[model samples]
Target: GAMNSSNYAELFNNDIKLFVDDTNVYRVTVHKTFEGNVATKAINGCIFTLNPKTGHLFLKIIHTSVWAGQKRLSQLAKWKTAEEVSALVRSLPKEEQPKQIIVTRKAMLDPLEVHMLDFPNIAIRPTELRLPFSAAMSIDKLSDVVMKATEPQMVLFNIYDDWLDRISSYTAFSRLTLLLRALKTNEESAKMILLSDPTITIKSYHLWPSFTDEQWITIESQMRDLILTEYGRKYNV
Candidate 1:
């Protein structure tokens, strides 16, 4: 059946593995599931988080793939003055209210819809989603749609590496994996999510923890046997 509980758990396994290695990995558990059907093995999805040192959870994250038409972009034609905006801002509680508010008088068609449908010269034909694969480009192309589709505090995970042709050794792979985890963890908590692989981005270079050659040698030495075993099996030699 499609309703396997393990599927949901496995989605965030890479994340849990890296983050919880510094803590109790087993402690990370499924808190709840939404719109689940046991017989069909279907679910809208689930929620999980790390147990904090003191209370409930450490961070709130949404792990999901992107889809076309998943989110919609909105626009309005007419803009109003500051007082008109201020009036709406003061209507709500100070904590609930935003710092500024600007309302449009004339709502217009979705910008994405207009661009794709109205502008034939500029619009490219959209591909069908018949197969399973990473929809990163689809999401990136519809960046505004996804951005507006999220809640006020939603943070998307965008730390996947895209530059490396292939991984040859466990050392290189694990180091890069840890670096990605570092970037992912940093992005989830603070700000700054990488648009490309960390290797190609100078802006992300400073965030990486510097380890000297000796430090790497000692580190790999500790995991030499494990690395060799992994390297051996990775190539199936």
Candidate 2:
């Protein structure tokens, strides 16, 4: 779960203080060569003292493009130069331009390999029969059920069938149940998965119709609870 306290000052003192100091936020402009063409943009930037006492780290940015021209890059063949991309961006209305964008991504850490070795139950399988089981369990049909669900109970039924793909046996089902209960009680674990997974991170923040920070938080919390209490109990336990 996101740290519950909204005490900006406290957050600054603990984490932000390490990198920034007390300073007025400023706007700064910079240019980037997009495919050999220079394009200028400005960012809201600031310099801050890392800490009142330590004075170790200072934060500053002239211009920061978290991910510049990334969306356009996906259609790289269509626009070979930065000038072309800039032109395309200019053609879009102000509201159409993406604010947040993808910077980079990496695969998730292998939890079992890193944390567990001795437990036979924790052994990793190189591959599992996703296709066969998905077919046998009629997951496509179940997804249609989910799409058509009008209430939470129907949604839970749809999700239960989906879990059948992962919880393949009695032992797996039991383990999944325990895992679900643990996650229900541990908000941090849920947040870690929500914020860290590449797909979730991208879709939650940058996809069209971007989610407000609070909206994402609420969705994450509700989804986590629903998955644990309803889907977890119905199928796994």
Candidate 3:
């Protein structure tokens, strides 16, 4: 049924099995969503971070992908001033220091937006979120969308009970399955990856401890046999 109940727990199974003696893996939960109001809604797509050399993947960030045309376009943007820009630059960790940061005036600035291509500024490229939704997506299809219709999509997830103001764990697991499966492939786009998004992104939105702590444990306890080996590591953010 297309209709969803007020409270339903969805479980998504992670199918990737990298059996190493101690394959280093970390659990990422939504420490905090970028912009959310704590509502029950599905995040249709996920964002990922991959390893370039071996095509090994890490971090399948699950969230709802917003369509831009639905929202009102207000030209009056935020971060117009220097300090606002400085604050954003300060958001990243010291190790992955960015040379320059692009503060979008648009209300919805999905890092992969096309408007950023024409940016003729004297500066550095953070190379963040260049490849969003690599899995279950064809590189050729992604290229066409970028070339034709690219909009600022936002990511949001529901945590609490639907009627009780929360999200179902079943759907949550299903989304995770989509993210995990996205990496279980042999595609060039799957190879192009950045350091993990959980660490590099905003501290307020870090998907660990708060966002990931409980969900991580739930996954480990329920899916122990499925996981060959996983390690406990913090983003060190």
After TM-score superposition, the amount by which residue 187's alpha carbon in candidate 3 deviates from its true location, in angstroms, is 10
Comparing 2 with 3 on lDDT, the higher-scoring candidate is 2
Model 3, 71-174: lDDT tens digits are: 32112111112222233234535543332232211222333123323332313122222222333233333223323433333223221212122333444434
Candidate 1 local lDDT, residue 65 = 26
Instruction: Give lDDT per model, in order.
Output: 0.26, 0.30, 0.28
TM-score winner between candidates 2 and 3: 3
lDDT of 2 at 25: 25
> Mind giving the per-residue lDDT tens digits that candidate 1 earns over 26-96?
11224344656232211111111211111111112222322113332111111111222223234535453
Q: In model 2, where is the ten-residue run with the lowest total lDDT?
A: 100-109
* Superposition error at 38 for model 1 (Å): 4.0
Tell me the tens digit of each residue's lDDT in model 2 across 39-134: 645332322212212222222221234224445322321122222223333454665432211101111113222322332332222221111111
Residue 149 lDDT (model 2): 34
**Most accurate candidate by lDDT:** 2
